[PDB]
Amino acid sequence: DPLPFFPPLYLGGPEITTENCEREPIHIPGSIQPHGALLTADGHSGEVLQMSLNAATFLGQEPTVLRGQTLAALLPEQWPALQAALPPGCPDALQYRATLDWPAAGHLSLTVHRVGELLILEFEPTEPHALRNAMFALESAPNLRALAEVATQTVRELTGFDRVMLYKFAPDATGEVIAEARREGLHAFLGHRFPASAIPAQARALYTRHLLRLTADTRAAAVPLDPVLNPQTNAPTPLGGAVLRATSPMHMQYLRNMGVGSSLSVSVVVGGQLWGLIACHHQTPYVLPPDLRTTLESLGRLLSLQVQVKEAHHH
Amino acid sequence: DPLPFFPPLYLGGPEITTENCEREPIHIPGSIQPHGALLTADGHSGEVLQMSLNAATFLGQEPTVLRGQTLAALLPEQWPALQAALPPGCPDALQYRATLDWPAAGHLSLTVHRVGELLILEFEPTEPHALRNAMFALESAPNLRALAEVATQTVRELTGFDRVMLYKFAPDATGEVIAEARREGLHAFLGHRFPASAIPAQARALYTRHLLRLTADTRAAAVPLDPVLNPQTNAPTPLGGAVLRATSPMHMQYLRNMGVGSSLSVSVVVGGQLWGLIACHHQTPYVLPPDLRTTLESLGRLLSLQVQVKEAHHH
Ligand SMILES: *C/C=C1/C(=C/c2[nH]c(/C=C3[NH+]=C(/C=C4\NC(=O)C(C=C)=C4C)C(C)=C\3CCC(=O)O)c(CCC(=O)O)c2C)NC(=O)[C@H]1C
Ligand SMILES: *C/C=C1/C(=C/c2[nH]c(/C=C3[NH+]=C(/C=C4\NC(=O)C(C=C)=C4C)C(C)=C\3CCC(=O)O)c(CCC(=O)O)c2C)NC(=O)[C@H]1C
Incomplete structure (x- = not known):
């Protein structure tokens, strides 16, 4: 049984030391590693709720312009399959995976999992x-x-x-x-x-x-999500099921x-x-x-x- | 402990019935299913020793013309890797796998395993x-x-x-x-x-x-290997490790x-x-x-x- 968590630093939490490291809220860093991009979306409507600040590097539209758009608009082919693959109540470790074309070399790998009513989408080259x-x-x-x-x-x-x-x-x-x-x-x-x-x-x-x-x-600096809190809950977004989670x-x-x-x-x-x-x-x-x-x-x-x-x- | 085998039909074995089915030598049918081709080769020299009669359908050279050629000539890229992957004494279930180009649609999948001093190569579209x-x-x-x-x-x-x-x-x-x-x-x-x-x-x-x-x-008829006996041993070739083995x-x-x-x-x-x-x-x-x-x-x-x-x- 681990101690209660500190609030994350973006909610005014204290600095981590070797005396309190067991309290760092590592599952909710509010940020990702920079070699991919992450979006979260409403699990019913597919409305995009949060975006990593580097999204336009990988997705080709500004985070503020993606916000509010539906995955049905953004990922026409994948959305029905995604939706059917990850029904409400499914394990948060269950994943939907697809490969997407993009203007660069190789492809874009998409990995999605569900946490509560949130879909968490990870994109990496x-x-x-x-x-x-x-x-x-x-x-x-x-x-x-x-x-x-x-x-x-x-x-x-x-x-x-x-x-x-x-x-x-x-x-x-x-x-x-x-x-x-x-x-x-x-x-x-x-x-x-x-x-x-x-x-x-x-x-x-x-x-x-x-x-x-x-x-x-x-040595790579993390990339913040925006907004940092999930609008569904007005609370931090759990990222433990996302490999892109900041360390x-x-x-x-x-x-x-x-x-x-x-x-x-x-x-x-x-x-x-x-x-x-x-x-x-x-x-x-x-x-x-x-x-x-x-x-x-x-x-x-x-x-x-x-x-x-x-x-x-x-x- | 299964009874001793019958000789296969090509060595003058008896017909199989419901009274003796436990004696059919199913691991040495001397033939393959027709949706792929099979070659066997010397595990040291890579000399091709046996060929399924349908080889020219999949490999583009006649079985009699492939016979005696080295895998170094036939598969220049793959032979060193194949050779290193399947050293003498390795498990007969261990496999080397590669994908080969061919004039038809898709590719040719190569699967190889070793039985004694014999390499058994299976090719399927x-x-x-x-x-x-x-x-x-x-x-x-x-x-x-x-x-x-x-x-x-x-x-x-x-x-x-x-x-x-x-x-x-x-x-x-x-x-x-x-x-x-x-x-x-x-x-x-x-x-x-x-x-x-x-x-x-x-x-x-x-x-x-x-x-x-x-x-x-x-309903598909099997395709005989040629020669039917492995020249190394002058004895039947064990095919239990080959998925193409005739049923x-x-x-x-x-x-x-x-x-x-x-x-x-x-x-x-x-x-x-x-x-x-x-x-x-x-x-x-x-x-x-x-x-x-x-x-x-x-x-x-x-x-x-x-x-x-x-x-x-x-x-
Ligand atoms: C007081 C805080 C400290 C601390 C925090 C911490 N450590 C982890 C995760 C890992 N630590 C690992 C330790 C080792 N790696 C090794 O190679 C060796 C020995 C050769 C050790 C002892 C490992 C393996 C992990 C897992 C992550 C990984 O595989 O890289 C975390 C959690 C990180 C995260 O998931 O975000 C935290 C908060 N570690 C300390 O030593 C003290 C100073
Ligand atoms: C006296 C000879 C007979 C005989 C010979 C035999 N049977 C097999 C292999 C299999 N038989 C299987 C039996 C079933 N499949 C089913 O769906 C059902 C029931 C719904 C049964 C009972 C199975 C599953 C196999 C394994 C092969 C496969 O998955 O298709 C062999 C060996 C075949 C080979 O590997 O070359 C032989 C010689 N079976 C008899 O019933 C008697 C008449």
């Missing part, structure tokens, strides 16, 4: 068999630690990340790196233990519900201090509890493409189940 | 997020039967198959349909039980090792008698034992594309693990 292959070595791994070793190697191979760790939580929420795949020459974190405060309780709770999060560029500034400083240029992790959830993380670092900024992120989510699921099976036959 | 989405309802299913119901619905949605069943094996190898998703108007098989002989012991044993098999057109004629007659035009199943393997099948029927011929088959293999894996978890919490 983009220019499974290996998963399938991997499941053999994951299945044949003789025990938990062997599974962990295979899993980190597989993820490195899929992603090209400089470092991939499987971080395991202890009952006191301290953690240990129990497996690591890394580029030659990088110093090892294998076996290193870290205190519970490295991943504070409100983060652990969010990561139990929304199983993948990332920081594409640990805690305190965690980004931690990553920079570590010499990390990009970070990504996937939760390993067993019996509804956070068991650990597949934790990835790159030395430079890196936008993992949406199809590869989807594959990592799927491996996270598969790994969660295999952990539960490998641990059981120790009983 | 072709013109994951839904998987990811599905895992939520699979995870939230409260028990085994609910999981089964979600799984058959998901597979129907992914594939558009007229009927999708989860067939569960009993300890005496009889089976029961414990879940079914079907097009409106189709009579139900839900709850129906079938004798052990419907899926004979040598089939059950193959399906424990090679987890997906299909009959794209239950037992006895099973194809069964499917036609059932009014099935296309069939596909995926094994559910738990603790190394065959627990059951995701069994799919279409009323007409249907070539499920290779990327969708790959997705079904991945769901089969995930379902196997979830079955094991849902059944355990009954203990």
